[PDB]
Structures are given as structure tokens and as C-alpha cells.
Symmetry: C11
């Protein structure tokens, strides 16, 4: 193989791999939306708990975000700091 | 490989990768719709908290939107600021 | 590669990418339908609140629509303002 | 490439793209069925709210339909007003 | 390309596209089954509402059916009124 | 292309298309099982309502079955009344 | 094409098609398990109505099984009464 | 084609088909786990029903297992009693 | 075909088939986690019945595990007791 | 085939197989998160049974982890103790 | 095969495998978001137990994170400590 062909196929696979990783983003959208619904329900019933409600919502939602960030980091590595092109030849 | 062939396959993979990333959009639609349902329930029950209900709904929904935006950004990079074509040759 | 072959494969991948992006439309249908169910249950108990119920339903449903629109925009770019064909050669 | 080969591969990809877009139809079926179930439960407890129940059900269900329509439009463009065949050569 | 080869690949893709579109049928089965479950609980508790329960169930279920029909129409077009074979050559 | 090659690839795609369509069967199993659970719950609490419970369960379940039948019909057409082999040559 | 090559590719596609159809089995497992859970809850509260509970559970579960059987039939046709090999040549 | 090539491709497709069929196992795990949760909840609230609870749980769970077994049987046929290799040549 | 080529493609397909079968593991994780949540709720309410809550939880969870084990067995057969390599030639 | 080509394709398939197995990890995340939510609500209600709540949560969550571990083991075998490379030639 | 071709295909498959493993991230986002919603609902009722609530939420969420981490580790091994390139030749 020539080197341009090698990079071409490794980078093409990297594009597919990056987009596939981003499918993980479904999870945080579902879970965080649930937490938001419960926060809405609680502050209508208890306006006085609005600090605790919102601070607790944000903490718990932040934890649920992490796997969306992991996928994003893997995608950005593949696009901008691609680790395979340097292993070639 | 010639250079037109190299770009052709890298850009074709980028189109597939971009569309695949957008599958993440399922999540925010599910979660944010749940939050909207709880907000509807709560206005009817306690009309006086409409202000808090809606502001809390929008904050929590904004957080649930983020992974849909991340996918969108990855797709737009692949289509409009493609990082692979410049690594070629 | 000749130029017709280059466009052919880039546009074929664009068709697949566009259709795949549209899978995101599952999410808004699920979430918005939930919000509609809660609106129905509340109108029934609390007709004095039909105003707020429906306006709140529509606002929250509008937010849940956004990722379905993002996919639609990516699909229409790929079909009607294709950004790859101009990068070729 | 000859022109018949170019059209053949672009149209074959368009067929796959169209069918894939239609997977979005899962969402409206799930969400609208939920809204129908809530409408049933309320007409039987509150026969006097049948007008508001059904009109609210239909409005909210109409909103949940939109992403199923978007996919259908993309599929029908690819089959009947295909935008790629004219970009060729 | 010869013309038999062109039709062969376009029709093969059409078969895959048609079957893929039919995956949408998951949605109506889930949503309509939910609506049926609510109708069952309701007639038991409020048998003097049977007429409304069942008529409301059927109306709301009919709306939830539509995206299953759209997929079916796309599949039957691809199999029986295939729009690509005539664009060839 | 020779004619045996043409039929071979069209029929191979038909087999894949048929099996893929059958994935729709997930939906009716989920929804109809829900309806069955509600029927069980109601006959235990209201044994004297068994008549309307079971007739309502079966009607609503029948409606939820339809998209599973549509997929089955598409699969059986592709296997036993294949519409593509006759369009060839 | 020779005839062994024709059968080889048609039967290979049939194996993939058969396994794919079997994915439908997810649905009955989910729905029937729900119905079983409701039956358990119900006998605990109404020991007396065990006869009806169980007979209703089994009837409703039988209906939810049907699409799992349809997929199984399509798979067994493709493996043991394959309809494509006889259309060849 | 030679005969070793024919068997190679039919058996490779059989391996993919077998693994794909096993995806059905998701369903019974979800449904049976639900039934187990309800059994747990009811042993607490009504300890005089432990016998009915567990026997009903196991019956209903057995029914929910069937589609996981069907997939398993199809996989084991493809691996150990492969029906395609004998149709060859 | 030579024999090394035959084994290579059969074993490559076996690796893909094995990994695909393992997707079934989603189901037990979902269902068993539900059962664990109900057990947590039933001990809190009745700390004194901890032994029958837990014995029922474990029995019902064991049943929900079975399809995860079936997939695991199919994967381990394909990797360590591969049935296809001996059918070759 | 030469031996480097044989290993190359078997190891490439092993990488795809390993990543696919890891999709199973969705299940434990969903189920274990449910169990955690129930533990949180139960310690709010009942601070006495906290030891029991947490010990029950951890036991039930451990059981729900197992299929995530099985996939992980299959992936690590394919990457670090690959059983196919030794069957070659 | 030459050695550059061998590495190229093994690394391209590794990119696809890595991205696919990251799909597991859906699970923790869903489950952890649920746990966050319950934590919100419970502080508002029981402000006095915020201690217990948040520490229990974080412990249970940490357990639900594990399979997202496993996928991440497999992806980072494939990208940065690739075990296949050294088995080659
Ligand atoms: C999924 C990986 C795509 C890599 C395709 C490269 C094809 C190049 C052919 O010359
Ligand atoms: C999924 C990546 C698609 C790349 C296909 C390129 C094929 C070019 C063949 O000449
Ligand atoms: C998924 C991308 C499809 C691109 C296929 C191009 C194949 C042309 C072969 O000569
Ligand atoms: C998914 C896109 C299908 C296009 C396949 C075209 C293959 C023609 C080969 O000569
Ligand atoms: C998914 C589209 C299938 C089209 C395959 C055609 C292959 C013909 C090769 O000669
Ligand atoms: C998915 C459609 C399968 C068709 C593959 C035909 C391959 C024949 C190659 O000569
Ligand atoms: C999915 C259908 C598989 C058919 C592959 C046949 C390939 C034979 C190549 O020579
Ligand atoms: C999915 C079916 C795999 C069959 C691949 C056979 C390829 C052999 C090529 O010579
Ligand atoms: C999914 C099965 C993979 C088999 C691919 C074998 C390709 C060998 C080509 O020479
Ligand atoms: C899914 C398995 C990938 C194996 C691809 C091997 C292709 C090598 C071609 O030279
Ligand atoms: C899914 C694995 C992608 C490997 C494709 C390699 C194709 C190289 C052809 O020369
Ligand atoms: Na997380
Ligand atoms: Na988010
Ligand atoms: Na949105
Ligand atoms: Na919509
Ligand atoms: Na509809
Ligand atoms: Na229907
Ligand atoms: Na059925
Ligand atoms: Na069953
Ligand atoms: Na089981
Ligand atoms: Na387990
Ligand atoms: Na875990």
C-alpha cells in the first residue's frame, strides 16, 4: 500500500467511528428530562424548596451528562488528534 | 491513490458519520416531552406557580438539550469544516 | 478517479447519511405524545385552566421538536445544498 | 464512469436512504397511543368533558405527527423528485 | 453498465429499503396496546361509558396507525410501482 | 449481466428485506402484553365484568396486531410472489 | 453465473434474513412479563380469583406471542423450505 | 465456484445469522425482571400468599421465556445441524 | 479456495457473530435492576422480612439471567469450540 | 492466502466483535440507576432502615452487573487472549 | 500482504470498534437521570434528609456509571494502546 491510501482508509473509519460514538447522547437527554420533570412537579407543590430542588437537579443531571461527554471526547480525538495516522508506516 | 479518490472516500465516510451522530436527537425529544407533560399537570393543579413551573421547565430542558447540540456540532464540522481533507497527502 | 465517479460516491453517501439523520424523529413523537396525554387528563379535571394547559403544552412541545428539526436541516443540506461536491478536485 | 452506472448507484443509495428515514415513524405511534389511552380514561370518568378531551387529544397528537411527516417528505423527494440525478455530469 | 445490471442493483436496493421502512410498525403496536389496556380498565370501572370508551379508543388508535400506513405505502411503491427503473437510461 | 446473476442478487436482497420487515413484530408483543396485564388486574378486582373486559381486550389487541401483519405480508410477497424477478430483462 | 454460486449467495442471504427476523422476539418477552407481574400482584390481593387471573393471563399472553411465531415461521421457511433456490435458473 | 468456497460463505453467513437471532434475549430479561419485582413487593405486603406468588411468577415467566428459546434453537441449528451445506451442489 | 482462506473468513464471521449475540445482555441488566429497586422499597417498609424479600428477589433475578447466559454460551462456542472449521473441506 | 492476510482479517473482525459486545452495558446502567432512585426515596422516608436499604441496593445491583461483565470478558479475550489466531494454518 | 496494508485494516476496524463500544453510554444517562429525579422529589418533601439523599444518590449513581467506564476503557485501549498491531507479522 501507498501511504495516502493507508491514511485515507484509517481516517474514513475514524469518521464513521466518531459519529457512531455520538449515539450515546440519547441517554442523557432521556434521563435529564425526567429529572427536569420531577423538579417542575416539586416546585409547584413546594415553592419554598426551590433552592434545594434546583441545586439537587443540576448535581444529579451533571452526573448523568458524563457518558455524553466521554463519547464527545472520543469523537474529537478521532477528528482532531487522530492517534492512528502516526502508527502508520 | 490519487488525491481525488482520497478525498472522495474520506468525504463519503464523513457524510455517513454526520447522519449517524444525529441519531442522538431521540433522547432530548423523549426527556423534554416528559418535562413538558409534568409542567402541564402542574399549571392546572396550582396556577399560581406558573412562573416557577415554566422557568424550571426551561432550565431543566436546556440541560437535556446539550447532547443533541454536541451531535449537531460534530455533523456541521464534518460537512463544513472537515478536518480530514487537510491531513491527506 | 474521474470526476463523475467522485460525485457519484459522495452523493450516494449523502443520501444514506440524510435518511439516517431522520431516525432522530422517533424522540419528539414519543415525548410530545406524552405531553398531549397529560394535557388531555388535566383539561378533563380542570377546564377553568384550558388556557394555561394548552399554551404550556405547546411551549414545552416546541422545545421537544428542536432535534427533529436539526436532523431535517442536515438532511436538506445534504440533498439540496450539498457541501462535499464543491470540495472535490 | 458512464452515466448509467452513476445514476444506478445514486438511485440505489436513495432507496436505502428513503426506507431508513421511515424508521422515525416509531415515535408518533408510541406517543399518540399514549395520548389516546389518557383520552379514554378521562371520557369515562368525565363524559361532560368529551368535547375538550377529544379536541385537546387531536391537537396534541397533530404536533406529535410532524416528524413522521418530515421523514415521509424526505422519502418521497428521494423517490419522486430525486435531487442527485441532476447534479451528475 | 448494461441495463440489466442497472435494474438489478436499483431493485435490490429497493427490496432492502422497503423492508427497512416496515420497522416503523413497532410504534403503533406499542401505543395502540397501551390505549387498549386503558380501555379495558375503564369499561370494568364504568360500563355505562362503553360507547364513549370504545369510540374514543378507536379514534385515537386510528391516529396512531398513520405512520405504519406511511411505511407500508413506501414499501408497496418500491415493490409494485417502482419509480427508479424508469429514470434509468 | 446474465440473467441468473440478476435474479440471484435481487432474490438475495429480498431475503434480507423480508427478515428486516419482521423486526416490526416487537411492537405488538409489547403493547398487547400491557393490555393483557390490565385485563388480569381488572378481572381480579371486578370478576363480574369478565365479559366486557375480555371482549374489549381482544378488540384493542386486534387493532395493535395490524402492523405485525403488514410486515408479514411484505415478507411473504418477497418470498412467494416476488415482484422484482419479472421486471428483469 | 454458475448455479452453485447462485445458490450460495441466495442461501447466505437467507441465513442473515432468518436471524434478523428473530429480533421480533424482544416484544413478547417484554409484554408477557408485564402481564405475569400483574397476575402475581393480583393473586396476592384476590387469592379467590386465581382461576380467572391465570386463565385471563394465558389468553392475553397467547395473543402477544403471535408475532414471535410469525418471525419463527419465516426463519424456518428460509432454512428448511427455502423458496428462492427453486426460482433460480 | 468450488465447493469449499460455497461452504465458506454459507457458514460465515450462518455465524452472523445465529448471533443476530440471539438479540431477542433482551425481551425476556426485561419482562421477567419486572415480574420478579412485583413478586418481591407482594411477598412483603401479603406474606400469606408466598405460594401463589412464586408459582404464578414462575408460570408467567416461563411463558415470557419462549422467544428467547426460539432464537437459541435457530442459533444451534445454524451452528450444529446446518441445513444449507447439504443443499449445495 | 485454499483452506487458510476458508478458515479465515469463517472465523472472522464467528467473531462478529459472538459479539452481536452479547447485545442480549441489555435485558437482564434492565429487568434485574427493577427487581432490586422493588426489593429496596420492600425492606425499608418491612425491615423484619428481609430474608423472604431477598430470597424471592434472587430466584426471580436468576430466571431473568438465563438469556444473558444463552448468548454467552453461543459466544464461547464460536470462540473456543468453533463448529464450522471442522465442516470445511 | 498468506498468513499475515489471514491474521489481519481475523483480528479486524475481533475488534468489531469486541466493540459490539460492549453495547450490553446499556442494560446495567438503566436498571442499577432505577435501584439507586428507589434507595434514595426509601432513605428519605425511613432513615432507620438505611443500612438495610444500602446493603439490599448493592446486592441487587451486583446481580444486574453480571451481563456487563460477561461482555467485558468477551471483549478482553478477543483483544488480549485471541483464540482465532492460533487456529490459523 | 505488506505490513502497511495489514496495520491499515486492523486500525480502521479498531476505530469502528471503539465508537461502537461507546453506544453503552446510553444506559448510565437514563438510569442516573432517574435517580436524580427521585433525589429532587425527596429533598422537597424531606428537606431534613438532604444528607442521606445526596450521599445515597451519588453512591447508587457511581455503581450505574461502571459500564460506561468499561466501554471508555476498551475504546482508549483500541486508540492508544492498540493490542493488534503487535500481533502482526
Ligand atoms: C467503515 C470503514 C470505511 C472504510 C472504507 C474504505 C474503502 C476504500 C476502498 O478503496
Ligand atoms: C461508509 C464509508 C463509505 C466509503 C465508501 C467508498 C467506496 C469507494 C469505492 O470505489
Ligand atoms: C454507504 C456509502 C455508499 C457509497 C457506495 C459507492 C459504491 C460505488 C462502487 O463502485
Ligand atoms: C447503500 C448504497 C448502495 C450502493 C451500492 C452500489 C453497488 C454497485 C456495485 O457495482
Ligand atoms: C443495499 C444495496 C444492495 C445492492 C447490492 C448490489 C451488488 C451487485 C454487485 O455486483
Ligand atoms: C443486501 C443485498 C445482498 C446482495 C449481495 C449480492 C452479492 C453478489 C456478489 O457477487
Ligand atoms: C447479506 C448477504 C450476504 C451475501 C454475500 C455473498 C458474497 C459472495 C462473494 O463472493
Ligand atoms: C454477512 C455474510 C458474510 C459472508 C462474507 C463472505 C465473503 C467471502 C469473500 O470472499
Ligand atoms: C461479517 C463477516 C466478515 C467476513 C469478511 C471476510 C473478508 C475477506 C475478504 O477477502
Ligand atoms: C467486519 C469484518 C471486517 C473484515 C474486513 C477485512 C477486509 C480486508 C480486505 O482486504
Ligand atoms: C469495518 C472494518 C473496516 C475495514 C475496511 C478495510 C477496507 C480496505 C480495502 O482495501
Ligand atoms: Na454518567
Ligand atoms: Na445533556
Ligand atoms: Na429539543
Ligand atoms: Na412533532
Ligand atoms: Na400517527
Ligand atoms: Na395497528
Ligand atoms: Na400478537
Ligand atoms: Na412468550
Ligand atoms: Na430468562
Ligand atoms: Na445479571
Ligand atoms: Na454498573
Amino acid at each position: 500500500m501507498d501511504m495516502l491510501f493507508a491514511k485515507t482508509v484509517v481516517l474514513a473509519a475514524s469518521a464513521v467511528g466518531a459519529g457512531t460514538a455520538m449515539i450515546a447522547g440519547i441517554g442523557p437527554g432521556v434521563g435529564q428530562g425526567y429529572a427536569a420533570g420531577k423538579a417542575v412537579e416539586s416546585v409547584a407543590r413546594q415553592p419554598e424548596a426551590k433552592g434545594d430542588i434546583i441545586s439537587t437537579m443540576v448535581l444529579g443531571q451533571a452526573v448523568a451528562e458524563s457518558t455524553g461527554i466521554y463519547s464527545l471526547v472520543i469523537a474529537l480525538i478521532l477528528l482532531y488528534a487522530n492517534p492512528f495516522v502516526g502508527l502508520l508506516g
